[PDB]
Design a protein around this ligand. Structure first.
Ligand SMILES: *[C@@H]1O[C@H](CO)[C@@H](O[C@@H]2O[C@H](CO)[C@@H](O)[C@H](O)[C@H]2NC(C)=O)[C@H](O)[C@H]1NC(C)=O
Ligand SMILES: *[C@@H]1O[C@H](CO)[C@@H](O)[C@H](O)[C@H]1NC(C)=O
Ligand SMILES: *[C@@H]1O[C@H](CO)[C@@H](O)[C@H](O)[C@H]1NC(C)=O
Ligand SMILES: *[C@@H]1O[C@H](CO)[C@@H](O)[C@H](O)[C@H]1NC(C)=O
Ligand SMILES: *[C@@H]1O[C@H](CO)[C@@H](O)[C@H](O)[C@H]1NC(C)=O
Length: 249
């Protein structure tokens, strides 16, 4: 039941100083700590995607590289998770992250993914996301991380068997979607996945119209790519990363 419904246009914007995360689970207070890790570089070129379904395949699969910075200004219900893998078919393993109103399901199986995968609400059905899922080796259900104008930031890394997800929710006063300043991303989950990830894709939710089988919709999200970079992070009195300098400039 794979159907091509999403067309996507893309523009390019500046990351400013977004994308800093806590590199470890160690409390540091009132110090300057220099760490070398996969960070999103300051003032880097970040791709802004507008995905439109109006009521052919024009929604290609993005590369993953060394890790992905994801951002969205959209509401919590439109973007509902992500797809990670290499071939995205039944011959290789894949990771599916699906959020809904009550919880989040993170599940690694052998999914036969559709060319334009989307979660459709009517209750929610995943029959348009994939046609089959066999030999499934990981499942993890927990409290959701897309909850409620509001900028939502995620960092995905795939390092030595662990899929690390970092997140942050920042209330941005109505204006430019990518704001100035710092908002460090707290460690959200470390998943013992152990799979090869070279490509990734965003999952959107589409509503049936009941009036053009699906309601017309748009979703805007920012994707940037992490690079091995040395950062100097400032930890303040309460342990929060309030500032950083990227050592290339
Ligand atoms: C949101 O996702 C959760 C996780 O899958 C759903 O809860 C499960 O629903 C199935 C019914 O197909 C039950 O068999 C499971 O026992 C439920 N698990 C848990 C942990 O509750 C939930 O139904 C989904 N909600 C919506 C609106 O789609
Ligand atoms: C971002 O990349 C595009 C294409 O690679 C390029 O045209 C544009 O100038 C870049 N923007 C910046 C700020 O480097
Ligand atoms: C994968 O699934 C197929 C059929 O679903 C089965 O024949 C095969 O043995 C499975 N392989 C593993 C490693 O589970
Ligand atoms: C990961 O997948 C890519 C693309 O299919 C492949 O070139 C690479 O060798 C794979 N790496 C491992 C460790 O399987
Ligand atoms: C840290 O926590 C204290 C405790 O009340 C608070 O007064 C202060 O505003 C917080 N922030 C900083 C930057 O010290």
């Amino acid at each position: 039941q794979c159907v091509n419904l999403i067309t996507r246009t893309q523009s390019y914007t500046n990351s400013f100083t977004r994308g800093v995360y806590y590199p470890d689970k160690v409390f540091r207070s009132s110090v300057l700590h220099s760490t070398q890790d996969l960070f999103l570089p300051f003032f880097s070129n970040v791709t802004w995607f507008h995905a439109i379904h109006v009521s052919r395949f024009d929604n290609p699969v993005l590369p993953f590289n060394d890790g992905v910075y994801f951002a969205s200004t959209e509401k919590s219900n439109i973007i509902r998770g992500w797809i990670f893998g290499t071939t995205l078919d039944s011959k290789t393993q894949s990771l599916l992250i699906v959020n809904n109103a009550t919880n989040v399901v993170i599940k690694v199986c052998e999914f036969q993914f559709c060319n334009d995968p989307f979660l459709d609400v009517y209750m929610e059905s995943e029959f348009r996301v994939y046609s089959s899922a066999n030999n499934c080796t990981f499942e993890y259900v927990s409290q959701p991380f897309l909850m409620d104008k509001n900028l939502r930031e995620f960092v995905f890394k795939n390092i030595d068997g662990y899929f690390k997800i970092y997140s942050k929710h920042t209330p941005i006063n109505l204006g430019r979607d990518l704001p100035q300043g710092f908002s460090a991303l707290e460690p959200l989950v470390d998943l013992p996945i152990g799979i090869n990830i070279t490509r990734f894709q965003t999952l959107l939710a589409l509503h049936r119209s009941y009036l053009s089988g699906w309601t017309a919709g748009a979703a805007a999200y920012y994707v940037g790519y992490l690079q091995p970079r040395t950062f100097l992070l400032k930890y303040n009195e309460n342990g929060t990363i309030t500032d950083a300098v990227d050592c290339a400039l």
